[PDB]
Write a structure and sequence with these properties.
This protein is α/β, with parallel strands linked by helices and 1332 residues long. The protein has 41 helices and 51 strands. Bound molecules: 4'-phosphopantetheine, 4-(4-nitrophenyl)-L-threonine and chloride ion. It is classed as hydrolase.
Length: 1332
């Protein structure tokens, strides 16, 4: 008893239907294709064919209607055909007009209840006639269109010759529906289901070539690249070597290309599967297509032939299970929701290879739009000639500009060409990016300055010169250099009495911070030895272990601290012991150098330990090198006075020590008691007249808090420099500092370093400009004799603006780790960029390389965490919390929730909890918002002065509603989801929310449904309603980091939407709005035009409140009238208008005459002329063209009277004017001299030109325009860093240079110049097992 006349939708239909309702203004789900042929086709018989065939089908006889409260489809008495002929043979570019038409036609939405699914055409050009068909994706997919087109072709061919056409092979779509119902009740569905549930079990944050959230709801922007024959020939060769189709090689390359561009191992490619073979759908035009994940593991170590084989099998498994809807995979895996997705970029394995023959001439079937564009999609396509291939890029026009798309295709073709060169080559040797995309790196150059060889040579140099200059100060006591030198020389003779050992030795120091410790360092260095600091408060196990690890010849301590040392047999020197005190005083004060004994430059100086603990071996050369290479920018003065605020176990102390004593300055030992009390520190620094001052950023924040409460002192300062240490800066917190010392002359010096590169590797001067721009933590540029490269997980350089790990090549590299060669081998590694046997150092710190050459420090990758769905650096979040005014500093930790995965927790310190959340949700995404906070006096200081995250107090369901609005919504979600306790902040799709249930809600709330997908929390739902609620002014983007707000006035006949293509070609430095004149929406034409002064008046009111920045008004064609009238009426309103931009207009000599000319023409005449210069080319129906003609004359009459009224001596409005004319515009002739006629409105006018642009350049050339407008008036996501040197599963070489260093190296990377293989391919543990 099943009927024939009203049928349910298939599972494929039901999904297109939903997508069609999500943006009711969108044509995105239409489909279209054409067939070019060289022949003259009969127009009347061709529509007979379309109309015959359309009735031979079923899906094209359908109209759709809602019921069941689902959606049903009903047949129609007759198949409507919409057929048009258009002859472009009279335009100069006929072929480009035809493609222009087709691109416009496919952008007209279809009313599924209309019942009109067939819009066809015959488009005649000089070479080819194009047979064109569009429809809606619900009734046809790509392969269906081609079926219908082959049938039209057959019917046509018969009709010309008066033959009877052969019977249709088309089956009935009603038994496709039974089959679909059958399958979803079968076992195969529950098999296929669990195949994908497993296959996709891991998928999280699928990669894309651009970071994007919102679901694609718009037609693609295309680019078409021919493939060179040489490459086509090589794919078939490369394919036969691997035993597969050539099309699989291309999938493999494209998959490898995504991985190599994102530097990510987990790649998921969407593949449309035809899903027709094997069943009844083969013969029936319909939509069965399914876009499914292809997961590849793109290892930098993987050979090309291997990935091609992964594709071969992955697709094989896809084709087995392909009947299971990908939309249901996505619902099952909870990948529908906030920015979540199943498939990434797409490519097709189904190419239309069969020429379709209309009469005596064949053509190729080419597809204009198959669906909404998600990230990037490639479509393989053939040519009219045999063995010819072409790529068609298709992208989401919201995320990708047309030149950005062309670039990826250009990059890709070159990558493919390299990919098929050697099947045995690993992809990790291949670069996705082209040379133009890279940034020049600083190559190490020698430093032309010289001080000396060792530290003692250069220090002794300074005692000769100025022996009575002051050296060190502790509390009230001060010593000149000569006394300091003598005291050290005396203690260094005592060392030589107290051990027989000689050579480069190691002397452990357990000491308080006092002058004994300064003397003991110098003594150690004078004696030919290296100092090994230990903190007197260290745990006794660590003292024990350091001493044994360095095999101390001597241990130098005090009477009180000697009790912290075992009786192990080590020799001690106790400085404050009265007998030892005297034994040294009686010693000769002559230098050991006077006897010919001292360190060499390559001998060690100190060994500092990091966190088991690892010791770092530094040389005299390393340290003096630092200062030799920094004199250029830093300019060391002998009258500087430095500050030692940092423990001697931390290499800051080496910097702030030898900064004075190499150069002639006086060092101030700051007791640790006063360093942790920021007020007295400020007392002490001014009192003692300090110049150079080091601090760790978290400490400096506590320091300004003291500068606040004591203005007496802060204006008494005299600092040549203010320096920043081994954390990252958050310049946002520096606002109050420039409010004080902007004119003091004190610079701000930021220095990135790490203990393995000799204290510091980079410098930036922080000025008043870059505090509030917020470009991130900026570490500046590399020291002269160092170098830094930023590399991907394959050890290749990353392009401009991309994450990577920093590798420090240079001469500040430590000799290595103490007794850990295995660390020397995986940390200090062979250097491909540089001289033969040199080596590079893994920082493990993440960085971006910006195109100008500055480095942005992003964070240490060890500590990068992952919350639900997202990887986040804790340092970007700790910054977001310092923006909130009372927040001074903060720290974020992590903990494991209940019986759950992960959550964030923050500890903030005040200056002078729920208000923080509010400010935060307006700032950051919901995923960054810590779970719960805590109030703390200060932050746990670490032994070396950093934030101790291991001591933080541990501070251990979902949040309820707020106002009556919220609960009003919550019960509505239960209506759909049921009685499941939901939280205000919960996600709708995780709590049982269905894809359809979300339309029912956003209906009930009268809100766009895309809003809810992109943000499925009832908080965002409420906040959308109350915080938002006849719109005179249309906003495109109002970003937060916006300097300039561009308000745009449309041309004649245009709406505000004509600036959209500009608004998203404009950098995010700009905010862009357009004012919508009434009656100018061709969709709602039935309101009434208004005059100038009214529009201008109602546009200041909304615009004084809604302006996001200083305004720059843009005008085009007749909009320039309303533009100048705007800047003028703003200027008087007490508004921030800084300028005006004038497109496509020159002032007219006789304004009285244009006004008499315009009033004498019909709008229908004005528009027909604008259409011949290339306007309104996308308007294909007479009804809306009529509407536009009416607007056109209004806008023209209004502009003409305006410029007629105010004459040749206007009211001078006095701003700068940016005049932009297109060089092909017939309405701006003789522009070279005539632009100057705009001087009438102000003194400063400058011209820009777009030579190949015409009058409508604001649309066609928009990219070029934003380039101009930004010149004058003015990202991917965070990935996982998998370092190949740490990759257990790969194979490794162990290398050697001639001078005895060893390095681990991955097999897949080519060998560096000066390095030799000591151990054949093996595992990581094996290779490290082979070092002697
Ligand atoms: P809901 O879970 O159904 O999500 C809405 C959706 C728009 C994401 C979903 O309906 C969908 O993916 N529709 C697209 C259908 C489609 O594009 N078919 C073409 C396959 S070749
Ligand atoms: N190597 C250390 C680390 O590994 O974190 C720091 O980066 C070094 C440092 C340099 C300069 C200053 N300072 O204050 O001038 C403090 C700290
Ligand atoms: Cl290791």
């Amino acid at each position: 008893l099943n009927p024939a006349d009203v049928l349910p939708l298939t599972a494929a239909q039901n999904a297109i239907w939903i997508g069609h309702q999500l943006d009711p203004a969108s044509a995105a789900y239409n489909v279209a294709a054409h067939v070019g042929v060289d022949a003259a086709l009969d127009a009347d018989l061709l529509r007979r064919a379309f109309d015959i065939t359309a009735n031979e089908t079923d899906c094209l006889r359908m109209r759709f209607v809602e019921t069941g409260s689902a959606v049903r489809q009903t047949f129609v008495a007759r198949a409507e055909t919409a057929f048009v002929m258009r002859d472009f043979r009279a335009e100069p570019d006929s072929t480009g007009a035809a493609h222009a038409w087709m691109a416009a036609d496919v952008r007209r939405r279809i009313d599924l209840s209309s019942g009109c699914l067939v819009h066809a055409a015959l488009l005649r050009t000089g070479t080819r006639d194009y047979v064109y068909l569009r429809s809606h994706h619900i009734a046809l997919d790509g392969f269906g269109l081609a079926m219908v087109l082959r049938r039209v072709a057959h019917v046509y061919g018969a009709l010309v010759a008066g033959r009877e056409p052969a019977a249709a092979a088309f089956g009935a779509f009603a038994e496709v529906i039974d089959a679909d119902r059958a399958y979803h009740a079968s076992a195969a569905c529950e098999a296929d289901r669990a195949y994908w549930r497993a296959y996709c079990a891991g998928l999280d944050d699928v990669p894309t070539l651009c970071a994007g959230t919102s679901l694609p709801s718009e037609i693609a922007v295309c680019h078409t690249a021919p493939v060179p024959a040489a490459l086509v020939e090589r794919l078939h060769d490369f394919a036969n070597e691997c035993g597969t189709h050539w099309i699989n090689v291309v999938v493999a390359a494209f998959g490898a290309f995504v991985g190599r561009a994102t530097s990510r191992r987990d790649i998921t490619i969407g593949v449309p599967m035809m899903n027709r073979l094997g069943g009844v759908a083969a013969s029936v035009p319909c939509t069965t297509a399914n876009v499914l994940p292809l997961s590849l593991d793109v290892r930098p170590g993987a050979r090309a032939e291997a990935l091609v084989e992964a594709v071969d099998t992955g697709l094989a498994g896809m084709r087995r299970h392909q009947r299971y809807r990908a939309e249901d995979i996505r619902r099952d895996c909870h990948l529908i929701g906030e920015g979540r997705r199943l498939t990434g970029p797409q490519i097709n394995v189904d190419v239309y290879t069969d020429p379709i023959a209309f009469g005596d001439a064949s053509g190729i079937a080419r597809v204009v739009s198959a669906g909404p564009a998600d990230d990037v999609s490639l479509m393989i396509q053939r040519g009219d000639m045999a063995d010819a291939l072409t790529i068609v890029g298709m992208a989401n026009p919201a995320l990708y500009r047309p030149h950005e798309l062309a670039r990826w295709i250009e990059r890709f073709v070159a990558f493919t060409t390299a990919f098929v060169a050697d099947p045995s080559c690993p992809v990790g040797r291949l670069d996705a990016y082209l040379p133009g995309d890279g940034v020049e790196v600083h190559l190490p150059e020698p430093a032309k300055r010289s001080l000396g060889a060792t530290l003692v040579e250069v220090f002794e140099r300074r005692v000769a010169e100025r022996p009575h200059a002051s050296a060190v100060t502790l509390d009230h006591t001060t010593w000149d250099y000569a006394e300091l030198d003598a005291r050290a020389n005396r203690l260094a003779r005592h060392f030589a009495a107290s051990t027989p050992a000689r050579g480069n030795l190691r002397v452990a120091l357990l000491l308080p911070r006092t002058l004994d410790a300064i003397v003991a360092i110098l003594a150690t260095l004078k004696f030919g030895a290296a100092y090994v600091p230990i903190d007197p408060d260290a745990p006794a196990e660590r003292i024990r272990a350091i001493i044994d690890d360095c095999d101390a010849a001597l241990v130098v301590t005090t009477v009180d601290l000697a009790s912290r040392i075992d009786a192990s047999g080590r020799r001690l020197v106790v400085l404050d012991a009265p007998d030892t005190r005297a034994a040294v005083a009686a010693a000769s004060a002559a230098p050991p150098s006077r006897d010919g004994e001292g360190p060499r430059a390559d001998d060690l100086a100190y060994i500092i330990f990091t966190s088991k603990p690892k010791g770092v071996k530094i040389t005299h050369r390393n340290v003096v090198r630092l200062f030799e290479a920094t004199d250029a920018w830093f300019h060391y003065r002998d009258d500087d006075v430095w500050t030692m605020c940092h423990a001697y176990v931390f290499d800051a102390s080496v910097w702030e020590m030898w900064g004075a004593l190499l150069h002639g300055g006086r060092l101030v030992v700051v007791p640790p008691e006063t360093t942790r009390a920021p007020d007295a520190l400020l007392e002490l620094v001014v009192r003692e007249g300090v110049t150079v001052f080091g601090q760790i950023p978290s400490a400096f924040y506590r320091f300004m808090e003291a500068q606040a409460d004591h203005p007496a002192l802060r204006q008494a300062l005299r600092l040549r420099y203010q320096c920043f240490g081994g954390e990252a800066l958050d310049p946002s917190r520096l606002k109050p500092w420039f409010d004080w010392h902007r004119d003091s002359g004190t610079r701000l010096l930021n220095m990135y370093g790490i203990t393995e590169t000799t204290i510091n590797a980079t410098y930036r001067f922080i000025d008043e400009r870059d505090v509030d721009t917020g470009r991130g933590s900026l570490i500046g540029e590399v020291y002269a004799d160092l170098g830094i490269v930023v590399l991907d997980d394959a050890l290749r350089p990353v392009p401009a603006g991309a994450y990577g790990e920093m590798y420090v090549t240079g001469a500040g590299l430590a000799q290595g780790y103490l007794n850990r060669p295995d660390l020397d081998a995986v940390r200090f590694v062979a250097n491909p960029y540089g001289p033969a046997g040199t080596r590079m150092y893994r920082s493990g710190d993440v960085a971006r390389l910006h195109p100008d050459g500055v480095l942005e420090y992003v964070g240490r990758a060890d500590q990068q965490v992952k919350v639900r769905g997202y990887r986040i650096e804790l340092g970007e979040v700790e910054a977001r919390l310092r923006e909130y005014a009372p927040v001074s500093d903060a720290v974020v930790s992590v903990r494991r929730d209940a019986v759950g995965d992960v959550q964030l927790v923050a500890h903030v310190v005040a200056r002078r909890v729920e208000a923080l959340r509010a400010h935060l949700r307006e700032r950051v995404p919901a995923y960054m918002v810590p779970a719960a906070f805590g109030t703390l006096d200060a932050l746990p200081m670490t032994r070396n002065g950093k934030v101790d995250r291991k001591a933080l107090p541990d501070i251990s369901v979902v949040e309820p509603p707020r106002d009556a609005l919220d609960e009003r919504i919550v019960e509505l979600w239960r209506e759909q989801c049921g009685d499941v306790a939901i939280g205000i902040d919960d996600n709708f799709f995780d709590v049982g929310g269905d894809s359809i249930k979300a339309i029912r809600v956003a209906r009930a709330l009268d809100m766009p449904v895309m809003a809810l997908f992109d943000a499925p929390t009832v908080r965002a739902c409420a906040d959308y309603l109350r915080d938002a609620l006849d719109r005179t002014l249309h906003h495109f983007k109002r970003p937060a980091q916006a300097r300039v707000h561009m308000v745009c006035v449309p041309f004649a006949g245009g709406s505000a939407l004509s600036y959209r293509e500009l608004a998203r070609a404009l950098p995010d430095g700009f905010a862009c709005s357009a004012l919508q004149l009434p009656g100018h929406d061709p969709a709602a034409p039935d309101e009434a035009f208004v005059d100038l002064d009214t529009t201008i008046d109602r546009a200041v009111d909304r615009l004084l409140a809604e302006a996001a920045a200083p305004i720059v008004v843009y005008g085009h064609c007749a909009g320039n009238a309303l533009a100048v009238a705007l800047v003028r009426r703003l200027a008087g309103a007490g508004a921030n208008v800084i300028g005006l931009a004038i497109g496509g207009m020159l002032l007219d000599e006789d304004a009285d005459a244009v006004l008499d000319e315009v009033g004498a023409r019909s709008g229908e005449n004005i528009v027909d002329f604008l259409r011949q210069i290339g306007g309104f080319k996308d308007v294909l129906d007479a009804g809306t063209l009529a509407a536009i003609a009416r607007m056109t004359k209004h806008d023209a009459m209004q502009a003409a009277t305006f410029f007629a009224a105010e004459t040749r001596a206007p009211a001078r409005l006095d701003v700068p004017l940016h005049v932009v004319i297109g060089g092909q515009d017939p309405l701006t002739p003789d522009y070279a001299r005539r632009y100057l006629d705009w001087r009438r409105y102000s003194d400063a006018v400058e011209l820009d030109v777009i030579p190949d642009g015409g009058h409508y350049f604001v649309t066609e050339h928009a990219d070029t325009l934003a380039g101009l407008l930004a010149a004058r008036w003015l990202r991917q996501a965070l990935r996982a860093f998998l370092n190949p040197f740490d990759d257990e599963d790969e194979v490794h070489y162990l290398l050697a240079n001639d001078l005895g260093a060893h390095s681990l190296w991955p097999a897949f990377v080519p060998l560096p110049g000066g390095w030799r293989v000591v151990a054949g391919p093996a595992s990581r543990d094996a290779c490290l097992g082979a070092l002697p």
